[PDB]
Design a protein around this ligand. Structure first.
Ligand SMILES: CC(C)C(=O)OC[C@H]1O[C@@H](n2ccc(NO)nc2=O)[C@H](O)[C@@H]1O
Ligand SMILES: CC(C)C(=O)OC[C@H]1O[C@@H](n2ccc(NO)nc2=O)[C@H](O)[C@@H]1O
Ligand SMILES: CC(C)C(=O)OC[C@H]1O[C@@H](n2ccc(NO)nc2=O)[C@H](O)[C@@H]1O
Lengths: 533, 533, 533
């Protein structure tokens, strides 16, 4: 017993020092492995060396910003005062310079590119104007979030699309995510056997979703996801000027699904204002999760375009949300509380993985049941429309025919050419009434038809559309905004915050409309930047 | 801003007028489409014209009954007083006339028809007498509900079976329902692939259930289901004299499943009396849902017989409920509250569809798990009985052999001939211990064997039974009354009304027995009316 | 009415007499059937006669012990007093005799058997010593439970393994269980079709689990399971000296899963001491449920070894629990309350079956989702380790390679030979990180490779291992202790006893360690007793 007591006392004395020493030893061993790998063959060790260098740089940056925050603020303070003193006259100069730059760039670039590249900008203006017309509180609107959101969308699109080094990186990331979800697919062969490929949707895709959920739970436990969310949220906060919680949610939704994104700020969900809740819902509807990215890339959709649309949607979502539902009440939640995100209660990484996997049970069942019901309803609608048309000697009437004409103006305003506008409208209708999976499947069929080659017109029916229309469709359809998703989001949010149940239902439909409009704005910018083939 | 305010004021002024104008314009457009279709070719447009005519007739009837209710009541009032004044002597005359008519009809028709058809009437009397013997409160019984229920069953059966125009309509409706669910069958190919036919029960049937649930939720939101329920409930109320809530529930169960039927009067479940709760459970157990109708028709079961049994069961269920558990306490719930049914809270039709689809998740899983467990138990029971019989040199002993002898008297009393009574008893045992699905499957196998033709007796074992026995089996087995299904009904009812859990548990078994007896009474009437082949 | 009243009075008078008479008549009929079967052919009727004889003997024994308990206690009392009077000097004599017998038995047998058999006893000593070193309260320990637990384990292993009559009985029981669950396998063909064999794990095994749950619920309602639990618990209580509640829980866990084990003493969970809660958790972690027994036997694992390990684990679990976390506070719960177990509230057997089947829905879904997630994580881990190894010119690095070296000492201390220690270590790592199912699958693959025959070494990689190593692996891996089960057990126990939630969370890891240590002790005993092939 005496030896046990002495050992306990010794452990108590050196606890912090022992933890520091063991962590340092582990880090030193990792560095030794890296240096040995570099010594043996640097070319093979290049990725590990790059990862180590970037990790060290980020850690040093974080430590410096933490420790020296006061000094940096003191250094920045005089500049802010000088700018404020001269701001009154200088604001007009800045605005005039920005307008002149916009005019010059638009004229030169878009005029040289062609007429269609300019209709995209026209559609962007039209969409922003229409959102302003039908706003909840038109009189009280803050234009800084809207203008900064559009500017950030433009800058990100310009960098990613007009620069080859930017273009390649997103393709590389898309390939990596596809490979990760391919690893996901293989693991599900055990449970359902090697004949799991027979039932493609139920066996591959739903385990893909489950594995993504488990991985996200594990990363949340480790504390990586939170870091990236904080970085992007700080960028949006320091530029757009939005509230902290809505910014954090918007940053999270880029790689998190709509259902699980509010869990980031669940503890403060009861106290959020109506505007912030509408912003949360709009961000949820306007961005897709990482799980579907692999499947969509597999269909044939471009990885770079998908990732660019996902990144660009969040600023668009916030801007459109602010313009649609401007805030009229003070925000109670503080920045420090919002940025802080509680880690998983799971004791160890494997418990976090188990808890993350278990949650997915409901989601897959809901998705499958909803798909079955809505596809059956679509078949019945097609049969009934065909029956009705036969009376008037037009037996070809169907859901697709109606949706082609109904949604054509939106496709045309986005910058698609006249002929392909109907085809894009069909996809937009499929995305609206049914989940985007089917619309992306149709788009992949069209892309395959174009790639194979052959007659553009087998008969008076067009078979495939141009590359630029495909890019614009990829941007437009990158969202979870569906008439079926409306119910599940309402249910989940009301479950998280029962007190706010009355508020959640009121703003859901406006949130869905705002999400669709944000997708349209992203498509407009992409069309404006992409050249005609 | 001023223009927006003026527009808002103008919209506020004409709100009701604008809604009326837009609805009228839509109706006028529909009428124009109908008239154009009739002009072009009346023969093709015949169904649309008939539907429009019947809809207009029903709308006008409803409007007139609403507006002129007081005038009609005033006109009816003197007749009621005159009847009441002379009722004392006239009641004996009416009863004697009814008895004489019953005697004449029974004698002529059944005596000419044969002996077996008369045993059906004998069995009807026997079942009613036995129910009266073992009533909860034999002294206090109201015979008007029982007599009116039997009379309505007889009238509906007579009309549907003995008249060709009545017989054809129910076949037509059965075909329509079959096609309507076939639309669901196709829709589930997407989720489970084109090889879904490999696993027949799990893939086709459960999506059939899901689609039926979604369609029922959508119709409930629109407000059609409620209309038919109100009409049939009013008929039963004005003839049988039962309480309003039980009548509403019974009318709904004709096309609604037992699990979802109480949702019609969910808000008033806490305050219902014990007798009304027993009536609800009996109505739930004695009728089948619309979802299984398509599958059962597909197996080979006659559509007209299935629909006729479903329609006839509800009056039988109410009459047997009243006789078995007569009410001894006053009914609190009013007619207006009961007939009024709150529409779905879903904001839009598609939200209603999603919510209806989501609820079905539990039901399908419960059905699958229960079927797996009970079929495994059946296999074990057969193996153990065969093992025991071999000791006594009878290795063929099995569940079917015992159930053939055990349930033979019930089959014989229903009017089935002596030879086929054992085969009907096997089906009755399968229906009692396991769901009606397996029993209908066996009946379909027997019907196919009869239709193919061949030896009636391959050996001393009979292979198939006569057509009339098949009809009586179709009537007898049209119910959801099973031992396995007892638990789920109790769970659902307790979930809806936690306060009444003690009342729910006490009366479940009696309700199940009452439902089985109501099914037997319907089978007896069908046997009485159907001629010997 | 008067006749009904007279009948009711007559029934009330003879209630108890009538019930006794009807039960006696049924028993007499069963006896007549048995005697007729014996008359016709005794050889065929042997099993039924044996079952009847054993049942009669057990009923008579229970009745006699009930009625004559006071007389037996009075007869036993003088012996207890005489032993207590002379215990002071006699205890040393007893301990010395036990030690001398242990020395003689160890020397004579093991020295003859070889070096390998003795390392198992050495490992047993090492494990006990290590558990004693790191005890929660090392100063205060009661050694009688530990010594008696080890003695009972040794005796049971000796009887079952070294005697042919004992060895055959467990094989017979295993075959019976395998057939009993093969009955379940057939029953699931209906729901999933005759092509259910295509998806082996999802369709066969999960229905096996469902059927086991249903049968266990039915037996719990009938009241058989409780009888066996009481008998074994009384044996453990009268020999080991543990508290009644922990003994009751441990005895049940032999054939009951960890999740449902505390429901036996749920009402008293709030008042249990910390040590008793630790014992409950340890017993839960160290034993497998009956459902997996059929599947594991089907894979090829020996039935006798599986059943022997399951039986032996509970005494080992209790002994290790007491040694690791000794009790420091008084037990409030009484023996009578603990032994008494409330029966299921289900009204009839079929309601119990339905309720048992319904409960299994969550378990199967959780198991499938966890398997998918963890297998995907394993694939990703193997790919990443292979990528890292290639940099250092060792592309074969993988999870198996690391776990072979990491867990080798544990395998060696159990008595496995040097060459097979690494192969056993891979299985131990699989069991620790993932559920025992995958480890047993790998063991079955190895057993099949051995049985088929061929090269022991296709190359410098060993292909299959010896029989004794397979037996030791079977003993070692018979547990539910996994890093993922940590969360599920904590959640389940905390759901039952919110008051003790903090204690449940505090003492989970120690129980998880103790379960693996107890499994290792059982494996050590099995290795010590099993001869080298
Ligand atoms: C799984 C994908 C390929 C699919 O075809 O499903 C369609 C619907 O699944 C919803 N969904 C999906 C993922 C997620 N988190 O990863 N949260 C969601 O809500 C979402 O509404 C979408 O429309
Ligand atoms: C689904 C059919 C084809 C089947 O084979 O399963 C039999 C069991 O399904 C229950 N059931 C069915 C439908 C419904 N609403 O549409 N409510 C229910 O409860 C019903 O009680 C019976 O026991
Ligand atoms: C079930 C078999 C076929 C399987 O492959 O999965 C293994 C996992 O199933 C858990 N399990 C199992 C039974 C039970 N009660 O009978 N309670 C449980 O928790 C337990 O954790 C184990 O690891």
């Amino acid at each position: 017993e005496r030896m046990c007591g002495r050992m306990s006392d010794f452990c108590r004395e050196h606890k912090t020092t022992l933890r520091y020493i063991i962590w340092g030893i582990l880090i030193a061993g990792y560095l030794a492995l890296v240096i040995a790998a570099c010594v043996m063959n640097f070319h093979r060790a290049l990725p590990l060396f790059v990862i180590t260098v970037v990790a060290i740089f980020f850690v040093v940056w974080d430590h410096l910003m933490a420790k020296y925050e006061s000094q940096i603020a003191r250094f920045l303070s005089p500049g802010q005062r000088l700018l404020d003193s001269h701001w009154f006259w200088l604001k007009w100069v800045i605005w005039g310079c920005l307008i002149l730059g916009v005019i010059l760039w638009l004229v030169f670039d878009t005029a040289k590119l062609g007429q269609q590249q300019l209709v995209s900008f026209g559609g962007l203006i039209i969409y922003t104007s229409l959102t302003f017309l039908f706003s909840k509180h038109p009189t009280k609107v803050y234009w800084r979030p809207v203008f900064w959101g559009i500017g950030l969308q433009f800058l990100l699109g310009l960098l990613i699309l007009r620069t080859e080094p930017g273009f390649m990186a997103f393709d590389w990331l898309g390939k990596q995510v596809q490979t990760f979800l391919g690893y996901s697919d293989a693991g599900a062969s055990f449970v359902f056997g090697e004949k799991y490929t027979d039932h493609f949707f139920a066996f591959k895709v739903l385990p893909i979703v489950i594995f993504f959920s488990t991985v996200m739970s594990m990363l949340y436990y480790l504390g990586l996801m939170q870091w990236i969310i904080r970085k992007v949220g700080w960028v949006m906060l320091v530029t757009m000027g939005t509230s902290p919680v809505e910014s954090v949610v918007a940053s999270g939704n880029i790689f998190i699904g709509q259902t699980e994104s509010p869990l980031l700020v669940r503890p403060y969900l009861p106290y959020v204002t109506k505007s912030e809740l509408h912003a949360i819902m709009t961000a949820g509807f306007s961005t897709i999760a990482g799980s579907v990215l692999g499947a969509y890339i597999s269909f044939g959709v471009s990885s770079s375009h998908l990732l660019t649309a996902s990144v660009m949607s969040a600023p668009a979502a916030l801007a459109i949300s602010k313009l649609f539902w401007p805030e009229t009440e003070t925000p109670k939640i503080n920045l420090k509380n919002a940025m802080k995100m509680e880690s998983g209660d799971s004791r160890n990484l494997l418990e976090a993985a188990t808890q993350g996997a278990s949650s997915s049970i409901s989601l897959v069942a809901n998705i499958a049941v909803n798909l079955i019901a809505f596809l059956a309803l679509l078949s019945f609608m097609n049969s009934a429309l065909s029956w009705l048309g036969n009376m008037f000697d037009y037996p070809q009437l169907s859901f697709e025919v109606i949706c082609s004409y109904v949604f054509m103006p939106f496709a045309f305003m986005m910058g698609v050419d006249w002929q392909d506008s109907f085809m894009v409208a069909k996809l937009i209708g499929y995305k609206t009434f049914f989940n985007e999976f089917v619309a992306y499947q149709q788009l992949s069929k069209l892309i395959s038809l174009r790639q194979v080659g052959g007659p553009k017109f087998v008969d008076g029916v067009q078979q495939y559309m141009s590359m630029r229309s495909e890019a614009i469709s990829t941007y437009a359809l990158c969202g979870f905004a569906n008439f079926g998703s409306l119910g599940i989001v309402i249910g989940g949010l009301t479950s998280m915050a029962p007190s706010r149940k009355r508020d959640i239902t009121a703003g859901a439909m406006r949130a869905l409309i705002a999400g669709t409009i944000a997708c349209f704005l992203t498509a407009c910018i992409a069309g404006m930047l992409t050249n005609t083939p």
